[PDB]
Amino acid sequence: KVAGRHGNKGIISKILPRQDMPYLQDGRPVDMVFNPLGVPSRMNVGQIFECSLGLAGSLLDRH
């Protein structure tokens, strides 16, 4: 069981090699893939804000 801090709980069903996980435009494959359908039903948009800001913080080296 993995979960964020916004009530987005999740069970791990698949483990894929890094070469077939979806990857960004810088070539880095993503580490985990979530279902976008969870947000509208559960109505927790905070993870959407945290997700985007986490990417910015890691690139800018900020917390």
Partner: protein, 37 residues
């Protein structure tokens, strides 16, 4: 995002009375007997 790992896989049968109703609905009399035998 910040993702945590939970404790369920670290920390850790009876057929209820409702399963009897479902088995009767299917009409599986021998299966239902097998549960109570």
């Amino acid at each position: 995002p910040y993702i945590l790992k939970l404790i369920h896989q670290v920390d850790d049968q009876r057929v209820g009375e409702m399963e009897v109703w479902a088995l009767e609905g299917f009409g599986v009399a021998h299966i239902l007997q097998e549960m109570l035998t």
